[PDB]
Amino acid sequence: MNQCPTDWEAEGDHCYRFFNTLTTWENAHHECVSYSCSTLNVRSDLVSVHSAAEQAYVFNYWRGIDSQAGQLWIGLYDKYNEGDFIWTDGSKVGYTKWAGGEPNNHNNAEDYGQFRHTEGGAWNDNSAAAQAKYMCKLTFE
Amino acid sequence: MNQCPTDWEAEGDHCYRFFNTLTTWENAHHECVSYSCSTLNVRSDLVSVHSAAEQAYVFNYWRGIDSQAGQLWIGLYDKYNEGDFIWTDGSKVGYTKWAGGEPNNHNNAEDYGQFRHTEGGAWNDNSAAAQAKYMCKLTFE
Ligand SMILES: OC[C@H]1O[C@H](O)[C@@H](O)[C@@H](O)[C@@H]1O
Numbered sequence: 274m275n276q277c278p279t280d281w282e283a284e285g286d287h288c289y290r291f292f293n294t295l296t297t298w299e300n301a302h303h304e305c306v307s308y309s310c311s312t313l314n315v316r317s318d319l320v321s322v323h324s325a326a327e328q329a330y331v332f333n334y335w336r337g338i339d340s341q342a343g344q345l346w347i348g349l350y351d352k353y354n355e356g357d358f359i360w361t362d363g364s365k366v367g368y369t370k371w372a373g374g375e376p377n378n379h380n381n382a383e384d385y386g387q388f389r390h391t392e393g394g395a396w397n398d399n400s401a402a403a404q405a406k407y408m409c410k411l412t413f414e
Numbered sequence: 415m416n417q418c419p420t421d422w423e424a425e426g427d428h429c430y431r432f433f434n435t436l437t438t439w440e441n442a443h444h445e446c447v448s449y450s451c452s453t454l455n456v457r458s459d460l461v462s463v464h465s466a467a468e469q470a471y472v473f474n475y476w477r478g479i480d481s482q483a484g485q486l487w488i489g490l491y492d493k494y495n496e497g498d499f500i501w502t503d504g505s506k507v508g509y510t511k512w513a514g515g516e517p518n519n520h521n522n523a524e525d526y527g528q529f530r531h532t533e534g535g536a537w538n539d540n541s542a543a544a545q546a547k548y549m550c551k552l553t554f555e
Pocket residue numbers: 375377379383397398399400
């Protein structure tokens with residue numbers, strides 16, 4: 274039994290939804306936020322990841338459905354303070370899974386976090402021009 | 415863990431919330447629907463009851479908070495077709511638990527369904543001027 278809205282998947286205290294469409298981090302951020310609902314205090318946002326179980330759940334959900342090589346935008350960013358990656362949903366950043374050599378802020382223009390499709394979804398920072406698939410998460414505040 | 419909004423209780427694939435405020439059926443209906451979230455296709459509505467288990471869950475939840483002698487509005491009414499009760503949430507009436515001699519359309523003016531506080535919540539029809547406590551339910555449409 275779960276109480277997730279239709280088309281959303283239950284794990285723990287949260288609901289998740291994969292969108293199999295290439296888009297920019299900024300557009301994915303709006304798309305996710307667009308599912309919020311103030312009357313039930315539901316905040317929707319890009320996924321934030323807080324444990325190895327949450328990382329795997331999200332990665333396997335994604336790859337269960339998308340077998341193309343490519344990346345998955347997450348809610349991790351350093352736009353407002355270069356070098357300090359935080360979550361858009363305001364949750365704490367205890368869990369990290371950086372790919373080797375990442376984050377590298379490559380050409381001083383990478384502020385937006387994404388899973389790779391390899392190494393269990395190891396993270397990369399990428400640019401505002403780049404495109405990827407995305408995943409949203411509900412928080413019941 | 416569940417995926418209900420804060421202050422709503424999870425049971426099966428639904429969430430429930432009791433409001434310990436005496437009001438009319440029409441205003442209870444209004445208040446419940448007010449929580450709906452079209453961005454997530456979440457209907458909030460007066461509770462509909464589809465089994466003994468649902469009945470008992472509802473009755474026990476209510477009577478754990480409210481010890482007063484009185485009734486509980488549910489989403490059952492026969493305004494449009496006298497004698498042919500329907501649920502406001504559009505679900506079909508299968509299960510019924512009418513108290514003895516109900517529905518009796520007393521004084522030709524009882525169109526609104528409610529639990530009694532006795533006999534496991536057996537149902538009565540009452541009028542548009544009557545007042546009762548109310549319970550809302552989320553449906554993930
Ligand atoms: O992998 C090294 C480098 O590769 C590309 O230039 C981009 O994906 C970068 O974000 C990444 O850091």
